[PDB]
Design an enzyme around this catalytic site. Structure first.
Site, PDB file in Angstrom:
ATOM      1  N   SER A   1      83.691  -2.717  19.350  1.00 48.38           N
ATOM      2  CA  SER A   1      84.442  -2.711  18.116  1.00 48.38           C
ATOM      3  C   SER A   1      85.580  -1.677  18.111  1.00 48.38           C
ATOM      4  CB  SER A   1      83.463  -2.508  16.971  1.00 48.38           C
ATOM      5  OG  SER A   1      82.941  -3.767  16.537  1.00 48.38           O
TER       6      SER A   1
HETATM    7  C1  LIG Z   1      81.744  -4.121  17.076  1.00 49.09           C
HETATM    8  O1  LIG Z   1      81.481  -4.131  18.274  1.00 49.09           O
HETATM    9  C2  LIG Z   1      80.728  -4.515  16.020  1.00 49.09           C
HETATM   10  N1  LIG Z   1      79.483  -4.858  16.657  1.00 49.09           N
HETATM   11  C3  LIG Z   1      78.795  -6.042  16.414  1.00 49.09           C
HETATM   12  O2  LIG Z   1      79.155  -6.918  15.632  1.00 49.09           O
HETATM   13  C4  LIG Z   1      77.531  -6.127  17.248  1.00 49.09           C
HETATM   14  C5  LIG Z   1      76.304  -5.506  16.631  1.00 49.09           C
HETATM   15  C6  LIG Z   1      76.427  -4.457  15.733  1.00 49.09           C
HETATM   16  C7  LIG Z   1      75.281  -3.891  15.174  1.00 49.09           C
HETATM   17  C8  LIG Z   1      74.020  -4.377  15.521  1.00 49.09           C
HETATM   18  C9  LIG Z   1      73.907  -5.428  16.427  1.00 49.09           C
HETATM   19  C10 LIG Z   1      75.055  -5.994  16.983  1.00 49.09           C
HETATM   20  C11 LIG Z   1      80.601  -3.390  14.989  1.00 49.09           C
HETATM   21  N2  LIG Z   1      80.520  -2.067  15.623  1.00 49.09           N
HETATM   22  C12 LIG Z   1      79.391  -1.279  15.105  1.00 49.09           C
HETATM   23  C13 LIG Z   1      79.873   0.135  15.001  1.00 49.09           C
HETATM   24  O3  LIG Z   1      81.125   0.273  14.899  1.00 49.09           O
HETATM   25  O4  LIG Z   1      78.963   1.012  15.033  1.00 49.09           O
HETATM   26  C14 LIG Z   1      78.859  -1.828  13.765  1.00 49.09           C
HETATM   27  C15 LIG Z   1      77.352  -1.618  13.565  1.00 49.09           C
HETATM   28  C16 LIG Z   1      79.601  -1.259  12.558  1.00 49.09           C
HETATM   29  S1  LIG Z   1      79.161  -3.626  13.900  1.00 49.09           S
END
Ligand SMILES: *C(=O)[C@@H](NC(=O)Cc1ccccc1)[C@@H]1N[C@@H](C(=O)O)C(C)(C)S1
Length: 624
Positions: free
Chosen positions: A368
């Site tokens: 992300s």
């Molecule tokens: C970016 O990679 C996002 N990740 C996902 O959608 C996968 C995911 C997230 C949480 C649990 C299982 C799978 C976002 N990135 C994180 C972050 O920035 O810490 C989030 C939890 C906000 S979702």
């Protein structure tokens, strides 16, 4: 000139046999042992080439300017220049002379001792004296030693007291008693031999390569090992008595660190009195390599990982100085270069976490954190309006029913989401919709402005980052997944710190530098300065807002602009699911430092954000 052309082929085949090391094949091309014919027999020529060329480590015999005339009715004379590589450098400008004989259907070479070396005669000998070169050091940006040559300290009765002293030495130095008795019982052990066991009261000093940081920089620096007979056959200019870099910078900078072997290669008479000096030059020690690494930041970055799988990259984003390149878990380079057991080396190779991997050079999915690039592209081409508010209902979303059961997933159910809200909560659905509205054509145009596909000028073996496998996504699902850092993206932490440096230089990408003396290279106009002045204030809120994903970093009380991410991968070896945690952070006031940390196959409720409080304090204090 028909028989003359056959003599040129005989000389060419004789040199090729000496070049390939097959001295027997070269000796069989000589005439019989007699006067005016060959000086020695075929078996004696074999032993003379094998002893002389073998002692000097002669390799790569190349000739030029060959001229073969005719002397007598059955005698043909030849002459040629020649050059060869020895253990003291390249021997060049050698004038060779001799004669040939075609007394039948074939043509042989009237072998003489001057065909080994130009001025050799009769029973002349060859002496080689060498002086080993000291290996250069590897230092950090402030002169602290990372790889030096220090003086190490390497650590009995009759019947019962001998077994009691072995148990006393095993308990006083944290050693295994089953290995102490195994060391003194090896096949090479003779009665009164000092059997070394491990390095550091004595119950009943040697020089070597020393790494002060040890495992904290084992992947980056590397280690050196004993030079083998096969290493000399590949490069005779090595020292058959010294060390060679096996991995890391010790291997990438092996030529500059080992120096050049000094000594003299001369020809003597029957008695060992010198006649002609062929090669002679003083020993040149290895030069020192000064890195951009900070020895205190490298140790802190590695200790912050706590032995878990991950890596951390810290840079000065305005110049690119790699302050720290940590990788965890790691191995002991001191035990790796100063003797290691077959069990401990197998434990490093059989470890599922693979401590030998340089994770800062391994391509991962950026997660992300990559939304900063997708947003900056959307602001450059006008696709993303910073104040436009999308209405998102629920946690799942898809373009239409053609996607099947796949839906972009977010964690926070926020109804009114703009660009600033998306970066605070890390909303995948927002970035997924903005990427689809942007189109693949306009999305690739902004991505191609970065370093995708470029091989960075660094002494670290790595593969160039990629946008996807092919030049086209050819899938709306893959285009959306690439929007929030998933899909077929492969960017190593070093390449991430380079791509993310645009936010510390108002849209200018500053390439990373590992060598301190190198000139700063940059790439201007990667993203617009307007997009930087829009995203960086939002990156502050990722730390300052109470619902920010990096709000735990607000406890530092320092100016920080960050963006977290937890990418999930398909493991296949494990069907439960493996997730990697990422963190990007830099000082938005002075742009003095930039940090990219990751946690491979993270544990539950663990993240790179939780472990970055210590390193962020040091980089903020010592790099304004
Ligand atoms: C970016 O990679 C996002 N990740 C996902 O959608 C996968 C995911 C997230 C949480 C649990 C299982 C799978 C976002 N990135 C994180 C972050 O920035 O810490 C989030 C939890 C906000 S979702």
């Amino acid at each position: 000139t028909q028989a003359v052309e056959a003599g040129e082929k005989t000389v060419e085949q004789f040199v090729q046999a000496l070049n390939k090391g097959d001295y027997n094949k070269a000796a069989e091309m000589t005439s019989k042992k007699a006067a005016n014919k060959s000086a020695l027999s075929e078996k004696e020529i074999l032993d003379k080439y094998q002893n002389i060329y073998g002692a000097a480590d002669v390799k790569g015999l190349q000739i030029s300017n060959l001229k073969v005339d005719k002397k007598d009715d059955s005698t043909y004379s030849f002459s040629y220049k020649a050059k060869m590589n020895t253990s003291l450098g390249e021997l060049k400008d050698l004038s060779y002379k001799g004669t040939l004989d075609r007394n039948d259907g074939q043509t042989t070479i009237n072998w003489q001792p001057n065909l080994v070396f130009p001025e050799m005669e009769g029973n002349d000998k060859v002496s080689l004296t060498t002086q080993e070169a000291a290996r250069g050091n590897i230092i950090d940006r402030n002169g602290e030693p990372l790889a030096t040559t220090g003086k190490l300290k390497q650590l009995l009765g009759d019947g019962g007291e001998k077994t009691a002293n072995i148990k006393a030495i095993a308990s006083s130095f944290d050693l295994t008693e089953d290995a102490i008795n195994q060391a003194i019982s090896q096949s090479w052990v003779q009665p009164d031999y000092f059997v070394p066991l491990k390095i550091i009261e004595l119950p009943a000093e040697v020089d070597g390569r020393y790494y002060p940081l040890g495992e904290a920089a084992a992947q980056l620096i590397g280690y050196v090992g004993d030079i083998t007979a096969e290493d000399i056959d590949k490069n005779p200019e090595l020292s058959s008595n010294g060390k060679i870099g096996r991995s890391g910078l010790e291997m990438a900078f092996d030529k500059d660190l080992r120096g050049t072997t000094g000594g003299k290669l001369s020809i003597t008479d029957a008695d060992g009195v010198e006649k002609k000096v062929l090669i002679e030059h003083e020993v040149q020690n290895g030069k020192d390599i000064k890195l951009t690494i900070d020895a205190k930041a490298q140790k802190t970055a590695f200790d912050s990982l706590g032995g878990k799988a991950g890596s951390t990259v810290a840079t000065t984003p305005k110049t690119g100085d790699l302050l720290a390149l940590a990788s965890s878990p790691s191995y002991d380079p001191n035990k790796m270069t100063n003797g290691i057991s077959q069990e401990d080396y197998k434990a490093y190779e059989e470890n599922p976490e693979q401590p030998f991997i340089s994770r800062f050079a391994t391509g991962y999915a950026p997660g992300s954190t990559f939304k900063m690039i997708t947003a900056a592209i959307g602001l450059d081409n006008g696709t993303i309006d910073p104040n436009e508010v999308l209405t998102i209902n629920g946690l799942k979303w898809q373009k239409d029913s053609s996607w099947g059961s796949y839906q972009v997933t977010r964690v926070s159910d926020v109804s009114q989401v703009d660009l600033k809200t998306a970066l605070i909560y890390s909303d995948n659905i927002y970035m997924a919709q903005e990427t689809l509205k942007m189109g693949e054509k306009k999305f690739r145009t902004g991505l191609d402005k970065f370093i995708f596909g470029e091989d960075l000028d660094l002494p670290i073996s790595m593969n160039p980052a990629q946008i996807s496998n092919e030049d086209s996504f050819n899938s709306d699902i893959l285009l959306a997944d690439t929007g929030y850092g998933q899909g077929e993206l492969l960017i190593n932490p070093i390449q991430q710190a380079a791509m993310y440096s645009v936010f510390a230089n108002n849209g200018t990408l500053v390439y990373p530098k590992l060598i301190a003396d190198k000139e700063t290279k940059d790439k201007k106009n990667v993203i617009g300065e307007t997009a930087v002045q829009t995203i960086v204030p939002d990156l502050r809120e990722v730390v300052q807002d109470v619902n920010g994903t990096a709000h735990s970093l607000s406890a530092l009380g320092i100016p920080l602009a960050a963006k977290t991410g937890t990418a999930e991968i398909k493991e296949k070896q494990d069907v439960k699911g493996k997730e990697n945690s990422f963190l990007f952070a830099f000082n938005p006031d002075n742009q003095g430092y930039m940090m990219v940390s990751m946690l491979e196959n993270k544990e539950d409720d663990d993240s790179a954000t939780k472990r970055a409080s210590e390193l962020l304090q040091y980089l903020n204090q010592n790099y304004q």
